[PDB]
Design a binder for these strands. Structure first.
Ligand SMILES: [Mg+2]
Ligand SMILES: [Mg+2]
Ligand SMILES: [Mg+2]
Ligand SMILES: [Mg+2]
Ligand SMILES: [Mg+2]
Ligand SMILES: [Mg+2]
Ligand SMILES: [Mg+2]
Ligand SMILES: [Mg+2]
Ligand SMILES: [Mg+2]
Ligand SMILES: [Mg+2]
Ligand SMILES: [Mg+2]
Ligand SMILES: [Mg+2]
Ligand SMILES: [Mg+2]
Ligand SMILES: [Mg+2]
Ligand SMILES: [Mg+2]
Ligand SMILES: [Mg+2]
Ligand SMILES: [Mg+2]
Ligand SMILES: [Mg+2]
Ligand SMILES: [Mg+2]
Ligand SMILES: [Mg+2]
Ligand SMILES: [Mg+2]
Ligand SMILES: [Mg+2]
Ligand SMILES: [Mg+2]
Ligand SMILES: [Mg+2]
Ligand SMILES: [Mg+2]
Ligand SMILES: [Mg+2]
Ligand SMILES: [Mg+2]
Ligand SMILES: [Mg+2]
Ligand SMILES: [Mg+2]
Ligand SMILES: [Mg+2]
Ligand SMILES: [Mg+2]
Ligand SMILES: [Mg+2]
Ligand SMILES: [Mg+2]
Ligand SMILES: [Mg+2]
Ligand SMILES: [Mg+2]
Ligand SMILES: [Mg+2]
Ligand SMILES: [Mg+2]
Ligand SMILES: [Mg+2]
Ligand SMILES: [Mg+2]
Ligand SMILES: [Mg+2]
Ligand SMILES: [Mg+2]
Ligand SMILES: [Mg+2]
Ligand SMILES: [Mg+2]
Ligand SMILES: [Mg+2]
Ligand SMILES: [Mg+2]
Ligand SMILES: [Mg+2]
Ligand SMILES: [Mg+2]
Ligand SMILES: [Mg+2]
Ligand SMILES: [Mg+2]
Ligand SMILES: [Mg+2]
Ligand SMILES: [Mg+2]
Ligand SMILES: [Mg+2]
Ligand SMILES: [Mg+2]
Ligand SMILES: [Mg+2]
Ligand SMILES: [Mg+2]
Ligand SMILES: [Mg+2]
Ligand SMILES: [Mg+2]
Ligand SMILES: [Mg+2]
Ligand SMILES: [Mg+2]
Ligand SMILES: [Mg+2]
Ligand SMILES: [Mg+2]
Ligand SMILES: [Mg+2]
Ligand SMILES: [Mg+2]
Ligand SMILES: [Mg+2]
Ligand SMILES: [Mg+2]
Ligand SMILES: [Mg+2]
Ligand SMILES: [Mg+2]
Ligand SMILES: [Mg+2]
Ligand SMILES: [Mg+2]
Ligand SMILES: [Mg+2]
Ligand SMILES: [Mg+2]
Ligand SMILES: [Mg+2]
Ligand SMILES: [Mg+2]
Ligand SMILES: [Mg+2]
Ligand SMILES: [Mg+2]
Ligand SMILES: [Mg+2]
Ligand SMILES: [Mg+2]
Ligand SMILES: [Mg+2]
Ligand SMILES: [Mg+2]
Ligand SMILES: [Mg+2]
Ligand SMILES: [Mg+2]
Ligand SMILES: [Mg+2]
Ligand SMILES: [Mg+2]
Ligand SMILES: [Mg+2]
Ligand SMILES: [Mg+2]
Ligand SMILES: [Mg+2]
Ligand SMILES: [Mg+2]
Ligand SMILES: [Mg+2]
Ligand SMILES: [Mg+2]
Ligand SMILES: [Mg+2]
Ligand SMILES: [Mg+2]
Ligand SMILES: [Mg+2]
Ligand SMILES: [Mg+2]
Ligand SMILES: [Mg+2]
Ligand SMILES: [Mg+2]
Lengths: 188, 124, 260, 155
RNA sequence: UCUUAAGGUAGCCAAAUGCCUCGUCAUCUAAUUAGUGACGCGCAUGAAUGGAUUAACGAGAUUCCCACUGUCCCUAUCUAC
RNA sequence: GCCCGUCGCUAGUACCGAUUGAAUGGCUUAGUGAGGCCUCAGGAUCUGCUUAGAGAAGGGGGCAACUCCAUCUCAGAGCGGAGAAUUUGGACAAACUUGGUCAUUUAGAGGAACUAAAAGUCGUAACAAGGUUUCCGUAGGUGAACCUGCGGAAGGAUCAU
RNA sequence: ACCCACUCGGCACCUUACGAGAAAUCAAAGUCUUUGGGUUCUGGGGGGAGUAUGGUCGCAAGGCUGAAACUUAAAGGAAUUG
RNA sequence: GCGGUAAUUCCAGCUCCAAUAGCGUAUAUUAAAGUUGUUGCAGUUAAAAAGCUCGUAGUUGAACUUUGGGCCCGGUUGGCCGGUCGGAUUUCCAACGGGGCCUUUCCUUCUGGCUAACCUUGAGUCCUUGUGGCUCUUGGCGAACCAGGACUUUUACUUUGAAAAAAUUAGAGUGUUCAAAGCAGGCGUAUUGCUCGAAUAUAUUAGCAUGGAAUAAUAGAAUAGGACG
RNA sequence: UAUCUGGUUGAUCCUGCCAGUAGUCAUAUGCUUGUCUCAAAGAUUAAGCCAUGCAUGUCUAAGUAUAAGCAAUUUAUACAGUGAAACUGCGAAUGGCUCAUUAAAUCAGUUAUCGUUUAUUUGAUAGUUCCUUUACUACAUGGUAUAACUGUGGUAAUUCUAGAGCUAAUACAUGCUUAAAAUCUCGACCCUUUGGAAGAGAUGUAUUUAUUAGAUAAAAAAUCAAUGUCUUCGGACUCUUUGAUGAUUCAUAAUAACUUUUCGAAUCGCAUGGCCUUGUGCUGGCGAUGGUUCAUUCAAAUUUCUGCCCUAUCAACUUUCGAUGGUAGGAUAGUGGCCUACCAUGGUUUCAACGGGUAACGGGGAAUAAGGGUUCGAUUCCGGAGAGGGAGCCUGAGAAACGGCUACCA
């Protein structure tokens, strides 16, 4: 089917190239997953030499980590909001790598308020010790905190769902988050 | 798909087709040693020419050159071994000399006659 | 061309087997094993073309299927098995022990060794990497992997091996002035000590060599196999001790030992 | 080539896996990664002091230089972050026993750590396929400008 | 060889100019008194009585093709008056 | 003596040419588009996991109370799986119809070359100051070679007042 | 202005011929089988033919570029004697 | 070029020639061909200098920059002896090459690792009246190359070398009975094995690697924005 | 192994070609043909067309035997010899043939993978699998559904197969398990210190993400935040651990998670032994097949530098509908305009681009012997390509396969 050779397609001089040999299986390519949101559904591709690839088509949850916080939580993927390659992916909420999605927050709230005893936005014994040892360390960040009030967090898919079957990302933070904040609203 | 069973031919054929001198001399050679062809002469003169050639190529090298020494000697001890090259003249400038008769004299054809035993190259 | 090549045309076969041009159209294609196709010796060529212990290949399979041959310790029942350099061929019957080791013309020569020296071998380490679970490992030219070796062992050193068990019992570092056996090139089969290594970052280090006749020659690092100290090797070398004689030298040697 | 903006793409331009924790107050904002290509090619200060991204940089990018190392003279600097160099050489024709001037134009990626101009002689390292045609990366500028300021005005 | 003031040159042709004539040869067709290309002892072509050639233009005369269709095979039905 | 051209005969070769001529091959627009593959669905049938009913089983250990595991059997209820025909949308895309392009070929009435060619018919152009010196370029003219005007060259018939 | 000597750069002639050529002849047409200073252009038997075809230039006449099938044992040069 | 009535070319008989288990023919190609000419052609009159001058690509391009002298080291042929039980090495000797030195003389460069080599000497001596000779550690060689830092004008040419399939070619050995071949084979106790082989060469252009520094290019310091510290 | 001869004239020297001459791993044809050895052979034209037969199958003590098979004999009443059929496994992706396409393609010599896949071979490599964690979960081993077979049938016709009834596994689908220790988060309590704690959970491998370690270019200091070990209670910290490459974000490891959860043996053959608390207890010999990851081997796929015949009566070419580059993604085993989205205007060319021709597969090589050359290579080895022409794809480690399927064309 698809062929990733270079035997079609003109030479840098612009010459036109002959049809030497027929299509080979090792130059193959396949169609995009064009993976979507909601209700897990995954098909396994049989690749070169045994070997499985997991094509994800529809996904409702992924595993998103909060890097500056050291932890990784599984949440719901609420929707696609930004995509640098193509806007039909944002409009179709199509999950690919580098897609900017909005997750769920509530597992990151449940972790933070139970780890810092501080609550976002707006009695046990050892627990009070830990909650005192932590601080000068609980300042969060204006942009990650105001996201929490909305119950949804900007994150950036970093896995390849049509490849791995996983939709795994990382929470937008600091410099990146500023950039895509500008982009988000400076088109909103 | 098998190894090529290699071959080559063993004679060459005179450039000038009709040279009375060369036909006279050749004929005398057939009637002297009892040969049936001019090919029997051509073949031997072919051997002589490949020898003379190697002899010239060796002679152009430097004296005491490793190849000239190794191959030149082997050729000389080879020609002595059969009886074409005399013991006195045993240093490849006589192999550059030489001639066809020296080769012809060494055939079992000519030897069986030479020490009697036949008393006619043809009876030989 | 669609998959692995299972045949071998006699002519494409490596020349250091000394197979006759005619008398067939194929040669034994060395099975996959410890040694590279082009630098191996298949058990059929050894049991029959070197050792004359058979006439047919059919008899080489008869010999082998009775576990007579055992290679480097284990039995080995593969007709075309890729035996190679430093390997120990061992016939229990006949009480014979061979080590595969190069000529000086660059071939594998029939070398008979003691019943006792035939229980260890040399192996040039080709890589030493920190394996899984932090267990370092060292792997030698003949495809042996050996966990937990000495820290000081690095690539290009050589290694004495148990054969009985796998363990490494000794190792000789790659230092200027150590007995060297050439494993490839036109200086294949020679032996001689090392002068010094040319570096060349990015590819192909040159190994200057001198043998025990004050004759020098260079080869690529890839082709150098350390086997001990000047004089003192570590295994029994073959006659001629890898010195290489000119065509003249060899002509006089063979045509001096002539008095019937 | 590049210059200005840095962050001038639809995607955020970042070095992969080089985290700068916002909790940790830093007086350098962004944490930068670099290396040296080897073969003694100094990773110039413009690559370490720089702020650009270029994942095809041999010093600040994700490409390894290995294989050939060649030199040519820069004849085109119109593609963004890549150039084309000419490689002349004489070809030997036996029958006539003389030579004839030939040439080939190699396309080569050029990191914004180098300010390259047409005419400069450049030293170029082989590396994995970067583009449809680019198989090389500029690793050293053996020239300067060719006495450009020495063509200035009158007294 | 008679004869004239001179005896048709360059061109062009069965031409809107050729009797014979539906000229002969080729081409287009299943088949062509049609069309075109040739030929020319041209009843009786021919040089401002202008000869020949011409892009463009034509409700001009003619031939063929594509498309098109009730022109036809072969007729039928409907609206208004 | 040699020799030029028209004109005439036989044979060959190639050229021009109405036929908007023909044929093979390689690309290729537009239109139509099989098939497998991927994907939205489909659900012939055929099971699962869970939940409850009724009839028997085996005991976790007691005098009545009390109680686990696996297995088979029929009203009845939730949440998923396999999966045929069928089928939505795609990339891949043979192939058909109609055109165009490039390459290689090729029929043709007729026209007009050249050759075999030396012979023929009409002249005498060249070779002798060839009987008008010859030749070049150009231009016109004439059965034919050729003649004439203008400018050259000597390879002239003059190396010379 | 003229005469004599010289030296540059000219247009030429004279005699030579060490040397060159097939020769006529040539101070280059010489220093070439004892074969190499640098560089541009053209030719490869005679006809067919500067024809056919394409491209290009021109108002035109024509210019530049420019084949092949076929045919043919000579065509040709310089000199000698008639 | 022969054949038109005595045909040395036809048709035959005779004889004769050449090659010979082979010989003729056709088509192609190679040699002859210095008629493709790099080596190596020709162009006044035989084929062939563009009517002329400009001129870009291309090819080509004057001379000059460490030359000269002095000292040491060790090789490989050749002579005159041979000492010797065909080859041997020292001195006497030339010849021809290689390496390092000092002459104003970068060898990239710091910072140690290492040292082989003498300016050393610490003793004296085997032994020819002594600089003939090396063991031998305590003041005094850099480069021989490790490895780390810091940098470097670019090429062409040549040398050597690595990396280098087999068969092919060249070629050594071996008596396939000869030969084309093949890679065998050859020795005895031929009743219980012994053994030589299966070479060497070419392998270029490009890439790699080392030596050379003539010949050719290239870069440098003039609005000093030069060099060393 | 450096050679020439015939033909222009009356004669001459030239130029010049024609003709002679010699060889061809160079074909054809003609006449003639006895012996030994060696032995090429439908390439050329038509990669035109094909009758019939054959050319790919395969079993070890060691996956599956209730053949209603054969043998019986020698112990075998679950099985046990031998063994059709069938399942299962592997192989059919090698070999052989042709030279049509192909002109920067292939090929070659030389590189590259710090850019990937790899059955097999060879060497390594696995105590962790259950679960609110005393009235337990088949481990002395959990589930069916099928072939062959029996039997009923269909069609003119094929290696067509339908309905019915059985039964296996190393086929299909499930699913238990094993030591010690340490390190992490939780933390019931108690008590104010500088602070400590019973006991609860988590930690195989693989997968996806994010994060950290992976030092070293010669030496020293202060402070903020957390927080390690040793008190001779103001304090100190002393020994302090480091793999590879020219070069990495490398090998490897640590934290937080993730997963329609990858592997972690429900298999086979030979022997049958030790050891008592006599349970047929608990142990145990040799090797087969498998199994995850790593290496190795056989490979593969791309890939750097340089080299191709004729042609200007081909000078401009390349971006319709990727042409040259940037970014991001998708796709791939993986790099890459391989593809898509956005963005730019680039790329090649008289040092001949682009186009056309080739009666063009490329190389090792062949013929011709002064040398320099010229010509040739369909064809015994290597590489490539194809299987009437195209495309598509299943299986698989490996094919875009054709002695595989699918569709179109012929
Ligand atoms: Mg993906
Ligand atoms: Mg095999
Ligand atoms: Mg076997
Ligand atoms: Mg870039
Ligand atoms: Mg650009
Ligand atoms: Mg680039
Ligand atoms: Mg008139
Ligand atoms: Mg007129
Ligand atoms: Mg008229
Ligand atoms: Mg008329
Ligand atoms: Mg009419
Ligand atoms: Mg009319
Ligand atoms: Mg017709
Ligand atoms: Mg009509
Ligand atoms: Mg008509
Ligand atoms: Mg008409
Ligand atoms: Mg009439
Ligand atoms: Mg008039
Ligand atoms: Mg009129
Ligand atoms: Mg007009
Ligand atoms: Mg009109
Ligand atoms: Mg009309
Ligand atoms: Mg009406
Ligand atoms: Mg005719
Ligand atoms: Mg028509
Ligand atoms: Mg036709
Ligand atoms: Mg379709
Ligand atoms: Mg799709
Ligand atoms: Mg025609
Ligand atoms: Mg025609
Ligand atoms: Mg006619
Ligand atoms: Mg003509
Ligand atoms: Mg004539
Ligand atoms: Mg006249
Ligand atoms: Mg006259
Ligand atoms: Mg006169
Ligand atoms: Mg006249
Ligand atoms: Mg003339
Ligand atoms: Mg002279
Ligand atoms: Mg004279
Ligand atoms: Mg000619
Ligand atoms: Mg024209
Ligand atoms: Mg005008
Ligand atoms: Mg014209
Ligand atoms: Mg012309
Ligand atoms: Mg013309
Ligand atoms: Mg007669
Ligand atoms: Mg005759
Ligand atoms: Mg006769
Ligand atoms: Mg002959
Ligand atoms: Mg010659
Ligand atoms: Mg010629
Ligand atoms: Mg030369
Ligand atoms: Mg010569
Ligand atoms: Mg000539
Ligand atoms: Mg002339
Ligand atoms: Mg002139
Ligand atoms: Mg011009
Ligand atoms: Mg000069
Ligand atoms: Mg000097
Ligand atoms: Mg010297
Ligand atoms: Mg060399
Ligand atoms: Mg002649
Ligand atoms: Mg004649
Ligand atoms: Mg004449
Ligand atoms: Mg005559
Ligand atoms: Mg006369
Ligand atoms: Mg002749
Ligand atoms: Mg001839
Ligand atoms: Mg014989
Ligand atoms: Mg036939
Ligand atoms: Mg054929
Ligand atoms: Mg054939
Ligand atoms: Mg035909
Ligand atoms: Mg049975
Ligand atoms: Mg099977
Ligand atoms: Mg094959
Ligand atoms: Mg079932
Ligand atoms: Mg380290
Ligand atoms: Mg027992
Ligand atoms: Mg296994
Ligand atoms: Mg891109
Ligand atoms: Mg990719
Ligand atoms: Mg553009
Ligand atoms: Mg442009
Ligand atoms: Mg050209
Ligand atoms: Mg072809
Ligand atoms: Mg060819
Ligand atoms: Mg070939
Ligand atoms: Mg062919
Ligand atoms: Mg390859
Ligand atoms: Mg066929
Ligand atoms: Mg196929
Ligand atoms: Mg096949
Ligand atoms: Mg077709």
């Amino acid at each position: 089917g698809i062929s990733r050779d270079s035997r079609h397609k003109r030479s840098a001089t612009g010459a036109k190239r002959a049809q030497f040999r027929k299509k080979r299986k090792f130059e193959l390519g396949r169609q995009p997953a064009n993976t979507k949101i909601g209700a897990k559904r995954i098909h396994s591709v049989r690749t070169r030499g045994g070997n499985k690839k997991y094509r994800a088509l529809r996904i409702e949850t992924g595993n998103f980590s909060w890097a500056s916080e050291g932890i990784s939580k599984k949440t719901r993927i609420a929707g696609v909001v930004y995509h640098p390659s193509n806007n039909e992916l944002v409009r179709t909420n199509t999950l690919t790598k580098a897609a900017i999605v909005q997750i769920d927050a509530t597992p990151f709230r449940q972790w933070f308020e139970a780890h810092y005893g501080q609550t976002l936005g707006k009695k046990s014994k050892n627990a009070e010790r830990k909650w005192a040892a932590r601080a000068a360390s609980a300042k969060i960040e204006s942009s990650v905190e105001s996201q929490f009030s909305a119950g949804r967090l900007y994150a950036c898919i970093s896995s390849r769902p049509g490849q791995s079957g996983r939709c795994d990302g990382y929470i937008l933070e600091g410099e990146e988050l500023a950039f895509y904040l500008r982009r988000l609203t400076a088109k909103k | 798909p098998r190894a090529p069973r290699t071959y080559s031919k063993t004679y060459s054929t005179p450039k000038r087709p009709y040279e009375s001198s060369r036909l006279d001399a050749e004929l005398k050679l057939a009637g002297e040693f009892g040969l049936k062809n001019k090919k029997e002469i051509y073949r031997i003169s072919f051997q002589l020419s490949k020898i003379r050639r190697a002899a010239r190529d060796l002679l152009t090298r430097d004296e005491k050159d490793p190849k000239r020494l190794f191959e030149g000697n082997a050729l000389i001890r080879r020609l002595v071994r059969v009886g074409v090259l005399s013991e006195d003249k045993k240093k490849l400038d006589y192999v550059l000399a030489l001639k066809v008769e020296d080769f012809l004299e060494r055939r079992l054809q000519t030897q069986v006659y030479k020490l009697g035993l036949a008393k006619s190259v043809h009876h030989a | 061309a669609r998959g692995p090549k299972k045949h071998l045309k006699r002519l494409a076969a490596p020349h250091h087997w000394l197979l006759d041009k005619l008398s067939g159209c194929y040669a034994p294609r060395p099975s996959a094993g410890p040694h590279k196709l082009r630098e191996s010796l298949p058990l059929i060529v050894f049991l029959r073309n070197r050792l004359k212990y058979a006439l047919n290949g059919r008899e080489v399979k008869a010999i082998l299927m009775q576990r007579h041959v055992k290679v480097d310790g284990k039995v080995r029942t593969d007709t075309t098995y890729p035996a190679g350099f430093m390997d120990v061929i061992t016939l229990d019957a006949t009480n014979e022990n061979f080590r595969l080791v190069y000529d000086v013309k660059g071939r594998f020569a029939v070398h008979r060794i003691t019943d006792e020296e035939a229980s260890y071998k040399l192996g040039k380490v080709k890589k030493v990497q920190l394996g899984k679970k932090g267990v370092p490992y060292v792997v030698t030219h003949d495809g042996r992997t050996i966990r937990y070796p000495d820290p000081n062992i690095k690539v290009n050193d050589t290694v004495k091996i148990d054969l009985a068990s796998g363990k490494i019992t000794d190792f000789i570092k790659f230092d200027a002035g150590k007995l060297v056996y050439v494993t490839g090139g036109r200086n294949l089969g020679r032996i001689g000590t090392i002068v010094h290594k040319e570096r060349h970052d990015g590819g192909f280090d040159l190994v200057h060599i001198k043998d025990s006749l004050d004759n020098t020659f260079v080869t690529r690092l890839n082709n150098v196999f350390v086997i001990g100290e000047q004089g003192k090797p570590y295994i029994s070398l073959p006659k001629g001790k890898g010195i290489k004689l000119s065509i003249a030298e060899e002509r006089d040697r063979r045509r001096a030992q002539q008095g019937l | 080539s590049t210059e200005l903006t840095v962050q001038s793409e639809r995607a955020f331009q970042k070095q992969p896996h080089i985290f700068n924790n916002p909790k940790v107050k830093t007086s350098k904002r962004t944490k930068r990664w670099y290396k040296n290509a080897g073969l003694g090619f100094k990773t110039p200060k413009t690559a370490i002091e720089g702020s650009y991204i270029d994942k095809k940089c041999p010093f600040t990018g994700l490409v390894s230089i290995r294989g050939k190392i060649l030199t040519g003279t820069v004849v085109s600097t119109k593609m963004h972050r890549t150039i084309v160099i000419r490689r002349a050489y004489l070809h030997y024709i036996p029958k006539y026993n003389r030579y004839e001037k030939r040439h080939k134009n190699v396309p080569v990626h050029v990191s914004p750590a180098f300010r390259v101009q047409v005419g400069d002689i450049v030293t170029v390292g082989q590396c994995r396929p970067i583009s449809k045609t680019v198989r090389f990366n500029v690793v050293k500028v053996s020239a300067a400008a060719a006495x450009x300021x020495x063509x200035x005005x009158x007294x």
